[PDB]
Tab-separated table of C-alpha atoms and ligand atoms in Angstrom:
chain	number	residue	atom	x	y	z
C	2	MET	CA	0.000	0.000	0.000
C	3	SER	CA	2.385	2.703	1.383
C	4	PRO	CA	5.045	-0.062	1.953
C	5	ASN	CA	5.285	-0.523	-1.844
C	6	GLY	CA	5.077	3.224	-2.122
C	7	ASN	CA	8.375	3.629	-0.230
C	8	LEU	CA	10.073	0.959	-2.301
C	9	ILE	CA	9.003	2.524	-5.610
C	10	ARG	CA	10.000	6.054	-4.545
C	11	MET	CA	13.451	4.682	-3.618
C	12	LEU	CA	13.577	2.673	-6.871
C	13	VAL	CA	12.981	5.905	-8.812
C	14	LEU	CA	15.830	7.408	-6.723
C	15	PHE	CA	18.267	4.553	-7.330
C	16	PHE	CA	17.626	4.905	-11.138
C	17	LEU	CA	18.156	8.614	-11.342
C	18	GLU	CA	20.964	9.088	-8.757
C	19	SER	CA	23.176	6.211	-9.867
C	20	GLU	CA	24.458	5.897	-13.439
C	21	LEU	CA	24.400	2.091	-12.874
C	22	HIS	CA	21.370	1.729	-15.156
C	23	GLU	CA	21.175	4.144	-18.090
C	24	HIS	CA	18.043	2.595	-19.636
C	25	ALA	CA	14.804	2.374	-17.654
C	26	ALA	CA	13.677	-0.611	-19.758
C	27	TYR	CA	16.938	-2.404	-18.859
C	28	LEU	CA	16.555	-1.627	-15.069
C	29	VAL	CA	13.025	-2.977	-15.097
C	30	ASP	CA	14.037	-5.970	-17.155
C	31	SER	CA	16.933	-6.725	-14.766
C	32	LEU	CA	14.723	-6.596	-11.662
C	33	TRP	CA	11.804	-8.418	-13.335
C	34	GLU	CA	12.471	-11.932	-12.131
C	35	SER	CA	12.914	-10.819	-8.475
C	36	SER	CA	10.593	-7.877	-8.244
C	37	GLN	CA	7.644	-8.564	-10.597
C	38	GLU	CA	4.939	-8.220	-7.880
C	39	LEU	CA	6.304	-4.826	-6.844
C	40	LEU	CA	6.870	-3.620	-10.440
C	41	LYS	CA	3.245	-4.470	-11.388
C	42	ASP	CA	1.641	-2.540	-8.423
C	43	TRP	CA	0.160	-0.097	-10.962
C	44	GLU	CA	-2.452	1.170	-8.461
C	45	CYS	CA	0.513	2.227	-6.270
C	46	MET	CA	2.192	4.015	-9.154
C	47	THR	CA	-0.871	5.924	-10.408
C	48	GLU	CA	-1.601	6.783	-6.776
C	49	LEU	CA	1.862	8.153	-6.225
C	50	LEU	CA	1.396	10.147	-9.421
C	51	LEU	CA	-2.123	11.385	-8.826
C	52	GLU	CA	-2.275	12.059	-5.014
C	53	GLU	CA	-1.241	15.188	-3.159
C	54	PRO	CA	1.359	14.831	-0.357
C	55	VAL	CA	0.876	14.907	3.455
C	58	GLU	CA	5.272	14.253	4.315
C	59	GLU	CA	7.584	14.918	1.159
C	60	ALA	CA	6.310	15.721	-2.429
C	61	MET	CA	7.757	14.220	-5.642
C	62	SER	CA	10.066	16.441	-7.706
C	63	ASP	CA	9.251	16.961	-11.392
C	64	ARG	CA	12.190	14.779	-12.537
C	65	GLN	CA	11.157	11.831	-10.346
C	66	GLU	CA	7.568	12.022	-11.488
C	67	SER	CA	8.969	11.775	-15.110
C	68	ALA	CA	11.150	8.859	-14.041
C	69	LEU	CA	8.271	7.090	-12.397
C	70	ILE	CA	6.062	7.401	-15.511
C	71	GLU	CA	8.912	6.047	-17.663
C	72	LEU	CA	9.446	3.151	-15.305
C	73	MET	CA	5.681	2.509	-15.207
C	74	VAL	CA	5.418	2.391	-19.060
C	75	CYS	CA	8.349	-0.055	-19.139
C	76	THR	CA	6.706	-2.351	-16.585
C	77	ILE	CA	3.445	-2.209	-18.638
C	78	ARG	CA	5.252	-3.294	-21.810
C	79	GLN	CA	7.104	-6.062	-20.092
C	80	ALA	CA	3.942	-7.268	-18.429
C	81	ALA	CA	1.911	-7.136	-21.696
C	82	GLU	CA	4.667	-8.570	-23.957
C	83	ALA	CA	6.047	-11.152	-21.497
C	84	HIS	CA	9.603	-10.871	-22.857
C	85	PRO	CA	12.644	-8.586	-22.259
C	86	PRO	CA	12.823	-5.338	-24.185
C	87	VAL	CA	14.554	-4.678	-27.496
C	88	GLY	CA	18.277	-5.302	-27.039
C	89	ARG	CA	18.036	-7.782	-24.162
C	90	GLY	CA	16.094	-10.595	-25.927
C	91	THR	CA	17.101	-14.078	-27.002
C	94	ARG	CA	11.710	-20.385	-26.294
C	95	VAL	CA	8.076	-20.947	-25.227
C	96	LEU	CA	5.960	-19.266	-22.541
C	97	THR	CA	5.094	-21.757	-19.851
C	98	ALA	CA	1.398	-22.342	-19.026
C	99	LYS	CA	1.666	-20.177	-15.885
C	100	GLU	CA	3.700	-17.435	-17.601
C	101	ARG	CA	1.027	-17.276	-20.357
C	102	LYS	CA	-1.801	-17.227	-17.748
C	103	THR	CA	0.034	-14.430	-15.880
C	104	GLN	CA	0.382	-12.484	-19.142
C	105	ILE	CA	-3.371	-12.720	-19.823
C	106	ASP	CA	-4.062	-11.762	-16.162
C	107	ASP	CA	-1.614	-8.849	-16.258
C	108	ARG	CA	-3.019	-7.602	-19.564
C	109	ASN	CA	-6.505	-7.641	-18.060
C	110	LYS	CA	-5.335	-5.755	-14.900
C	111	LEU	CA	-3.407	-3.044	-16.614
C	112	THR	CA	-6.174	-2.518	-19.153
C	113	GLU	CA	-8.983	-2.204	-16.640
C	114	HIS	CA	-6.690	-0.071	-14.552
C	115	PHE	CA	-5.244	2.146	-17.187
C	116	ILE	CA	-8.535	2.631	-19.136
C	117	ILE	CA	-9.803	4.268	-15.884
C	118	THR	CA	-6.526	5.881	-14.727
C	119	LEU	CA	-4.841	6.929	-18.067
C	120	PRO	CA	-7.386	9.667	-18.734
C	121	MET	CA	-6.692	11.076	-15.222
C	122	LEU	CA	-2.906	10.912	-15.646
C	123	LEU	CA	-3.197	12.676	-18.988
C	124	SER	CA	-5.389	15.311	-17.422
C	125	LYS	CA	-2.915	16.170	-14.576
C	126	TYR	CA	0.240	16.116	-16.713
C	127	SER	CA	-1.479	17.500	-19.881
C	128	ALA	CA	1.150	20.207	-20.565
C	129	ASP	CA	4.321	18.105	-19.903
C	130	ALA	CA	5.078	16.918	-23.473
C	131	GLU	CA	7.687	14.309	-22.514
C	132	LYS	CA	5.354	12.881	-19.866
C	133	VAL	CA	2.261	12.902	-22.177
C	134	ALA	CA	4.150	11.298	-25.013
C	135	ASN	CA	5.312	8.621	-22.541
C	136	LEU	CA	1.813	8.022	-21.144
C	137	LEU	CA	0.331	7.609	-24.708
C	138	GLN	CA	2.595	4.646	-25.295
C	139	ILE	CA	0.196	2.843	-22.939
C	140	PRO	CA	-2.986	2.118	-25.063
C	141	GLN	CA	-1.030	0.002	-27.548
C	142	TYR	CA	-0.875	-2.585	-24.722
C	143	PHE	CA	-4.583	-2.479	-23.801
C	144	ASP	CA	-7.067	-5.313	-24.423
C	145	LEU	CA	-9.298	-2.892	-26.420
C	146	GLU	CA	-12.276	-5.287	-26.341
C	147	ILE	CA	-12.628	-4.289	-22.640
C	148	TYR	CA	-13.963	-0.921	-23.771
C	149	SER	CA	-17.203	-2.899	-24.470
C	150	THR	CA	-17.049	-5.786	-21.903
C	151	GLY	CA	-16.692	-3.412	-18.865
C	152	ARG	CA	-19.480	-1.042	-20.017
C	153	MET	CA	-16.493	1.275	-20.007
C	154	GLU	CA	-17.656	3.491	-22.837
C	155	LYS	CA	-17.588	6.408	-20.359
C	156	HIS	CA	-13.761	6.141	-20.086
C	157	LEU	CA	-13.141	5.826	-23.847
C	158	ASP	CA	-14.982	9.090	-24.140
C	159	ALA	CA	-12.713	10.285	-21.320
C	160	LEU	CA	-9.468	9.230	-23.003
C	161	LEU	CA	-10.574	10.835	-26.338
C	162	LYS	CA	-11.437	14.015	-24.486
C	163	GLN	CA	-7.845	14.149	-23.146
C	164	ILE	CA	-6.246	13.190	-26.440
C	165	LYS	CA	-8.168	16.070	-27.940
C	166	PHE	CA	-6.835	18.409	-25.154
C	167	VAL	CA	-3.293	17.247	-25.752
C	168	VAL	CA	-3.279	17.805	-29.576
C	169	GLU	CA	-5.039	21.117	-29.071
C	170	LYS	CA	-2.394	22.279	-26.505
C	171	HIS	CA	0.737	20.821	-28.235
C	172	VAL	CA	3.007	21.131	-31.340
C	173	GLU	CA	5.955	18.797	-30.443
C	174	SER	CA	6.361	16.074	-33.017
C	175	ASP	CA	6.612	13.389	-30.342
C	176	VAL	CA	3.355	14.403	-28.631
C	177	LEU	CA	1.448	14.662	-31.936
C	178	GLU	CA	2.740	11.426	-33.339
C	179	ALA	CA	1.861	9.754	-30.025
C	180	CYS	CA	-1.709	11.026	-30.373
C	181	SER	CA	-2.025	9.910	-34.046
C	182	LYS	CA	-0.821	6.401	-33.277
C	183	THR	CA	-3.231	6.269	-30.334
C	184	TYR	CA	-6.277	7.135	-32.441
C	185	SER	CA	-4.905	4.447	-34.809
C	186	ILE	CA	-4.935	1.764	-32.073
C	187	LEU	CA	-8.395	2.706	-30.743
C	188	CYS	CA	-9.840	2.883	-34.298
C	189	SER	CA	-8.972	-0.219	-36.358
C	190	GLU	CA	-8.652	-2.855	-33.614
C	191	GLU	CA	-12.361	-3.413	-32.468
C	192	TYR	CA	-15.573	-2.755	-34.487
C	193	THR	CA	-17.612	-1.977	-31.358
C	194	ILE	CA	-15.553	1.155	-30.587
C	195	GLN	CA	-14.420	1.877	-34.191
C	196	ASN	CA	-17.511	3.901	-35.027
C	197	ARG	CA	-17.097	6.035	-31.843
C	198	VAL	CA	-13.405	6.782	-32.282
C	199	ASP	CA	-13.753	7.518	-36.017
C	200	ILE	CA	-16.457	10.084	-35.138
C	201	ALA	CA	-14.153	11.782	-32.591
C	202	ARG	CA	-11.067	11.528	-34.805
C	203	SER	CA	-12.858	12.887	-37.905
C	204	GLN	CA	-14.369	15.747	-35.876
C	205	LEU	CA	-10.889	16.596	-34.531
C	206	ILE	CA	-9.365	16.727	-38.030
C	207	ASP	CA	-12.233	18.903	-39.321
C	208	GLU	CA	-11.640	21.539	-36.630
C	209	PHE	CA	-7.961	21.707	-37.627
C	210	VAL	CA	-8.524	21.571	-41.408
C	211	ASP	CA	-10.834	24.564	-41.042
C	212	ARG	CA	-8.305	26.390	-38.828
C	213	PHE	CA	-5.458	25.479	-41.250
C	214	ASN	CA	-7.441	26.637	-44.341
C	215	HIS	CA	-8.532	29.871	-42.768
C	216	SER	CA	-4.883	30.389	-41.682
C	217	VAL	CA	-3.519	29.445	-45.113
C	218	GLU	CA	-5.716	32.078	-46.602
C	219	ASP	CA	-4.692	34.589	-43.918
C	220	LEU	CA	-0.978	34.167	-44.686
C	221	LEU	CA	-1.214	34.176	-48.539
C	222	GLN	CA	-3.636	37.066	-48.926
C	223	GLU	CA	-1.144	38.857	-46.603
C	226	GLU	CA	3.586	41.988	-44.640
C	227	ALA	CA	2.625	38.773	-42.903
C	228	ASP	CA	2.112	38.550	-39.111
C	229	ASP	CA	3.947	36.298	-36.569
C	230	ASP	CA	0.438	35.096	-35.600
C	231	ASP	CA	-0.310	34.290	-39.297
C	232	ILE	CA	2.893	32.242	-39.432
C	233	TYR	CA	2.261	30.479	-36.053
C	234	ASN	CA	-1.340	29.635	-37.057
C	235	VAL	CA	-0.315	28.090	-40.413
C	236	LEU	CA	2.565	26.134	-38.964
C	237	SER	CA	0.903	25.108	-35.708
C	238	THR	CA	-2.173	23.683	-37.466
C	239	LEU	CA	-0.230	22.157	-40.371
C	240	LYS	CA	2.086	20.341	-37.881
C	241	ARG	CA	-0.950	18.612	-36.329
C	242	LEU	CA	-2.318	17.555	-39.724
C	243	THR	CA	1.021	16.365	-41.095
C	244	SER	CA	1.593	14.280	-37.949
C	245	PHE	CA	-1.717	12.541	-38.434
C	246	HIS	CA	-1.510	12.277	-42.270
C	247	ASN	CA	1.105	9.541	-42.068
C	248	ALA	CA	-1.170	6.980	-40.420
C	249	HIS	CA	-4.575	8.484	-41.304
C	250	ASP	CA	-5.918	8.976	-44.875
C	251	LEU	CA	-6.808	12.610	-44.937
C	252	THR	CA	-7.275	12.816	-48.766
C	253	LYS	CA	-11.032	13.760	-48.510
C	254	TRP	CA	-9.789	17.087	-47.237
C	255	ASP	CA	-7.788	18.321	-50.272
C	256	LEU	CA	-4.679	19.214	-48.184
C	257	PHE	CA	-2.268	18.885	-51.124
C	258	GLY	CA	-3.696	22.072	-52.620
C	259	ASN	CA	-2.949	24.458	-49.723
C	260	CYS	CA	0.465	22.900	-49.043
C	261	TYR	CA	1.279	23.419	-52.737
C	262	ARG	CA	0.293	27.111	-52.444
C	263	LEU	CA	2.577	27.625	-49.417
C	264	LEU	CA	5.465	25.882	-51.233
C	265	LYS	CA	4.940	27.728	-54.558
C	266	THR	CA	4.645	31.072	-52.734
C	267	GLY	CA	7.847	30.236	-50.905
C	268	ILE	CA	9.601	29.498	-54.210
C	269	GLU	CA	8.231	32.568	-56.000
C	270	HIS	CA	8.687	35.208	-53.328
C	271	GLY	CA	11.412	33.323	-51.433
C	272	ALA	CA	10.108	34.251	-47.943
C	273	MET	CA	8.307	31.276	-46.469
C	274	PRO	CA	9.552	30.120	-42.997
C	275	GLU	CA	11.616	26.973	-43.118
C	276	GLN	CA	9.391	24.939	-40.813
C	277	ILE	CA	6.222	25.759	-42.831
C	278	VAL	CA	8.070	24.651	-45.972
C	279	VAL	CA	9.386	21.446	-44.388
C	280	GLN	CA	5.953	20.475	-43.074
C	281	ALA	CA	4.141	21.475	-46.285
C	282	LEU	CA	6.560	19.166	-48.147
C	283	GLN	CA	6.053	16.303	-45.716
C	284	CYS	CA	2.230	16.692	-45.831
C	285	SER	CA	1.985	16.841	-49.652
C	286	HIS	CA	4.187	13.725	-49.748
C	287	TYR	CA	1.863	11.898	-47.401
C	288	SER	CA	-1.206	12.992	-49.535
C	289	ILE	CA	0.573	11.586	-52.612
C	290	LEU	CA	1.344	8.176	-51.081
C	291	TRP	CA	-2.266	7.841	-49.978
C	292	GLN	CA	-3.440	8.901	-53.455
C	293	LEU	CA	-1.263	6.076	-54.762
C	294	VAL	CA	-2.650	3.503	-52.357
C	295	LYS	CA	-6.253	4.253	-53.451
C	296	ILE	CA	-5.148	3.937	-57.108
C	297	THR	CA	-3.212	0.650	-56.694
C	298	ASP	CA	-6.009	-1.034	-54.772
C	299	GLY	CA	-8.962	0.267	-56.859
C	300	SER	CA	-9.372	-0.373	-60.614
C	301	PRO	CA	-8.430	3.060	-61.827
C	302	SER	CA	-9.359	4.535	-65.199
C	303	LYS	CA	-7.102	6.271	-67.644
C	304	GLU	CA	-8.060	9.720	-66.326
C	305	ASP	CA	-7.437	8.747	-62.642
C	306	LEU	CA	-3.849	7.892	-63.518
C	307	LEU	CA	-3.479	11.007	-65.609
C	308	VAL	CA	-4.771	13.245	-62.772
C	309	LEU	CA	-2.436	11.597	-60.216
C	310	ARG	CA	0.470	11.942	-62.694
C	311	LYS	CA	0.015	15.656	-63.108
C	312	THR	CA	-0.047	15.951	-59.263
C	313	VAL	CA	3.200	14.000	-58.907
C	314	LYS	CA	4.988	15.819	-61.746
C	315	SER	CA	3.952	19.140	-60.232
C	316	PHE	CA	5.250	18.008	-56.761
C	317	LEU	CA	8.611	16.614	-58.033
C	318	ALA	CA	9.065	19.936	-59.714
C	319	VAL	CA	8.473	21.580	-56.276
C	320	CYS	CA	10.987	19.368	-54.396
C	321	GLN	CA	13.589	20.063	-57.089
C	322	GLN	CA	13.054	23.767	-56.789
C	323	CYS	CA	13.285	23.390	-52.940
C	324	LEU	CA	16.825	22.057	-53.263
C	325	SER	CA	17.685	25.642	-53.901
C	326	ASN	CA	16.050	26.925	-50.611
C	327	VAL	CA	18.649	28.694	-48.332
C	328	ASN	CA	17.619	26.709	-45.246
C	329	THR	CA	19.436	23.429	-45.187
C	330	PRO	CA	16.576	21.595	-43.418
C	331	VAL	CA	14.401	22.335	-46.482
C	332	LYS	CA	17.102	20.872	-48.745
C	333	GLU	CA	17.403	17.784	-46.687
C	334	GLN	CA	13.618	17.281	-46.687
C	335	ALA	CA	13.315	18.056	-50.420
C	336	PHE	CA	16.196	15.668	-51.010
C	337	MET	CA	14.715	12.998	-48.787
C	338	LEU	CA	11.413	13.172	-50.655
C	339	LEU	CA	13.098	13.102	-54.098
C	340	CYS	CA	15.059	9.986	-53.233
C	341	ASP	CA	11.828	8.496	-51.851
C	342	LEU	CA	9.511	9.441	-54.801
C	343	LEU	CA	11.964	8.716	-57.624
C	344	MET	CA	12.254	5.207	-56.197
C	345	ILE	CA	8.420	4.793	-55.738
C	346	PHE	CA	7.423	6.090	-59.210
C	347	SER	CA	10.351	4.178	-60.789
C	348	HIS	CA	9.623	1.221	-63.015
C	349	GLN	CA	9.354	-0.874	-59.821
C	350	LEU	CA	5.769	0.487	-59.797
C	351	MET	CA	5.003	-1.947	-62.675
C	352	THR	CA	5.846	-4.975	-60.534
C	353	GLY	CA	3.264	-7.627	-59.558
C	354	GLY	CA	1.088	-7.490	-62.744
C	355	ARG	CA	0.447	-3.788	-62.229
C	356	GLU	CA	1.347	-2.652	-65.821
C	357	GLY	CA	-1.707	-0.384	-65.903
C	358	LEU	CA	0.401	2.061	-63.895
C	359	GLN	CA	2.890	2.862	-66.734
C	360	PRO	CA	1.598	6.406	-67.089
C	361	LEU	CA	2.624	7.053	-63.426
C	362	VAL	CA	6.352	6.143	-64.017
C	363	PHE	CA	8.919	8.984	-63.827
C	364	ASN	CA	12.511	9.164	-65.028
C	365	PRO	CA	14.327	12.119	-63.571
C	366	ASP	CA	15.923	14.357	-66.179
C	367	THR	CA	19.643	15.287	-66.422
C	368	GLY	CA	19.290	18.610	-64.619
C	369	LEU	CA	17.613	16.868	-61.644
C	370	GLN	CA	20.241	14.124	-61.540
C	371	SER	CA	22.933	16.815	-61.468
C	372	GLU	CA	21.180	18.498	-58.539
C	373	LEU	CA	20.799	15.192	-56.688
C	374	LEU	CA	24.559	14.766	-57.142
C	375	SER	CA	25.140	18.400	-55.979
C	376	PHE	CA	23.382	17.991	-52.597
C	377	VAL	CA	25.477	14.926	-51.811
C	378	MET	CA	28.741	16.878	-52.437
C	379	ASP	CA	27.474	19.790	-50.391
C	380	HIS	CA	25.505	18.143	-47.540
C	381	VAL	CA	26.439	14.517	-47.061
C	382	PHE	CA	30.214	15.146	-47.509
C	383	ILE	CA	30.950	18.176	-45.349
C	384	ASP	CA	34.141	19.555	-43.676
C	385	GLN	CA	32.834	20.291	-40.148
C	399	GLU	CA	28.289	16.696	-28.430
C	400	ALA	CA	25.074	14.685	-28.508
C	401	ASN	CA	23.755	16.592	-31.581
C	402	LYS	CA	26.660	15.426	-33.831
C	403	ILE	CA	26.227	11.668	-33.425
C	404	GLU	CA	22.581	12.392	-34.421
C	405	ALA	CA	23.390	14.706	-37.321
C	406	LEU	CA	25.778	11.977	-38.699
C	407	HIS	CA	23.131	9.266	-38.880
C	408	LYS	CA	20.865	11.705	-40.773
C	409	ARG	CA	23.475	12.316	-43.466
C	410	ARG	CA	24.013	8.585	-43.451
C	411	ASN	CA	20.300	8.170	-44.281
C	412	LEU	CA	20.430	10.919	-46.893
C	413	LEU	CA	23.189	8.953	-48.571
C	414	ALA	CA	21.542	5.564	-48.129
C	415	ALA	CA	18.407	6.973	-49.774
C	416	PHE	CA	20.498	8.416	-52.608
C	417	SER	CA	22.337	5.136	-52.865
C	418	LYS	CA	19.212	3.295	-53.933
C	419	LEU	CA	18.910	5.596	-56.991
C	420	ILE	CA	22.459	4.731	-58.009
C	421	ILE	CA	21.978	0.980	-57.741
C	422	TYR	CA	18.959	1.119	-60.225
C	423	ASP	CA	20.433	3.633	-62.683
C	424	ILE	CA	17.834	6.258	-61.889
C	425	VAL	CA	20.676	8.784	-61.556
C	426	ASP	CA	23.974	8.611	-63.463
C	427	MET	CA	25.694	5.679	-61.706
C	428	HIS	CA	29.172	6.677	-63.084
C	429	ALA	CA	29.120	10.402	-62.127
C	430	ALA	CA	28.052	9.272	-58.649
C	431	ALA	CA	30.934	6.840	-58.208
C	432	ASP	CA	33.329	9.591	-59.348
C	433	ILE	CA	32.217	11.600	-56.293
C	434	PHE	CA	32.728	8.503	-54.143
C	435	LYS	CA	36.286	8.263	-55.540
C	436	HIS	CA	37.052	11.919	-54.806
C	437	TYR	CA	35.922	11.647	-51.139
C	438	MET	CA	37.519	8.227	-50.456
C	439	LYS	CA	40.842	9.490	-51.909
C	440	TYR	CA	42.721	9.550	-48.584
C	441	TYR	CA	41.646	6.012	-47.860
C	442	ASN	CA	42.967	4.782	-51.280
C	443	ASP	CA	46.182	6.809	-51.055
C	444	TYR	CA	47.298	6.290	-47.396
C	445	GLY	CA	44.992	3.713	-45.802
C	446	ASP	CA	47.273	0.736	-45.676
C	447	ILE	CA	50.004	2.887	-44.063
C	448	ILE	CA	47.644	4.318	-41.445
C	449	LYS	CA	46.202	0.872	-40.834
C	450	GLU	CA	49.467	-0.914	-40.026
C	451	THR	CA	50.759	2.024	-37.978
C	452	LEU	CA	47.805	2.058	-35.566
C	453	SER	CA	47.981	-1.710	-35.378
C	454	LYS	CA	51.366	-1.357	-33.505
C	455	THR	CA	50.215	1.116	-30.770
P	501	O2D	O1	6.168	28.244	-30.898
P	501	O2D	C1	6.004	29.032	-31.760
P	501	O2D	C2	4.973	28.787	-32.786
P	501	O2D	C3	5.056	27.331	-33.047
P	501	O2D	C4	4.229	26.885	-34.214
P	501	O2D	C5	4.213	25.408	-34.193
P	501	O2D	C6	5.588	24.860	-34.000
P	501	O2D	C7	6.602	25.880	-34.297
P	501	O2D	C8	6.487	26.978	-33.281
P	501	O2D	N1	6.718	30.121	-31.875
P	501	O2D	N2	7.880	30.487	-31.203
P	501	O2D	C9	7.974	31.256	-30.101
P	501	O2D	N3	9.225	31.373	-29.765
P	501	O2D	N4	9.967	30.659	-30.680
P	501	O2D	C10	9.140	30.167	-31.550
């Protein structure tokens, strides 16, 4: 009750204060055999999180740490295996039984308690994002079984509050994925969630559209810019896992990107998001066309869309802001692979009119970026920025392998940059081998 409450408070302290466990998931995993009973006292945890003190309060950091530990215990309980990077087998009868029992407990519990947790910590993005990892583990059918419809409403109310209050890409993506899990994985609740999710979108599409018009008709305000970006961010987040094509979003993103090209003065984040959103619209347009039996004119309308967007991403290579370039590049190396001749695989030869070969000028520019932005002269931010450039190359690399860009002019650049390995590598190798 409060005995487990002391232990858990001290366990949060031992995690934070000692750098003996760096990963929460690993700490939990390590203790799991010995301290399962304690680590699945979820009523204790939510209590510690939700109650007000008598004495000694929790500090903001330790609350955060508790939530993270809690989410890790939930996973391990639900999944019944160690986390990614500690894995290795059959569940025994009793282990399976415990898994079903634990899943039931945490679902009933968290259905009721997750809306409350989200309410209290609604503005703490890192906490909210961490809490919204929880529904993926629920036994969704219990939203019907328990006559628990009141708490699904409750959750959806809070998810609405979160998206409405936040712009962080983690928070938003966490929300999107959550609607995703509540939607498609039970018919009973599907109709209810779809109604709440579609009403949410609507409110933002209207705000976005009004804001798009505000900005473009306009001397443009900081408000105008915050409204366009803020709303767009929400929609782009969702547009990855939700098919928002019924709202013609591609049109207003295209206006923001063309205005930015013409007059040069569109904020980098609006441009980056507008690109990402348009891209997501396009992929979803494709999915509807693959799966349906499309006519000639369907294909020809999608083609014109794609040609007009590849034109835009090309032009965006020349944007001063290097995040735009990277995004534009990323999308080019995505799209030119997608609308390659691969598109006519699996008896899909109807799609020929959608195939695109990038011209010489575009291949030259897709070489240019690599010379300028993968291969550059000159803590935690640099190990991250490296893996990005690594991905930018790996995405370019696919175009080389299938002769979509000039495979010889590419390799020439790879020569030029590997020169010091070919000229002095052996000598540097053997030298370091004797020290
Ligand atoms: O947060 C905003 C507006 C917001 C729009 C959605 C995400 C980008 C930023 N502005 N800002 C204030 N101080 N620095 C930037």
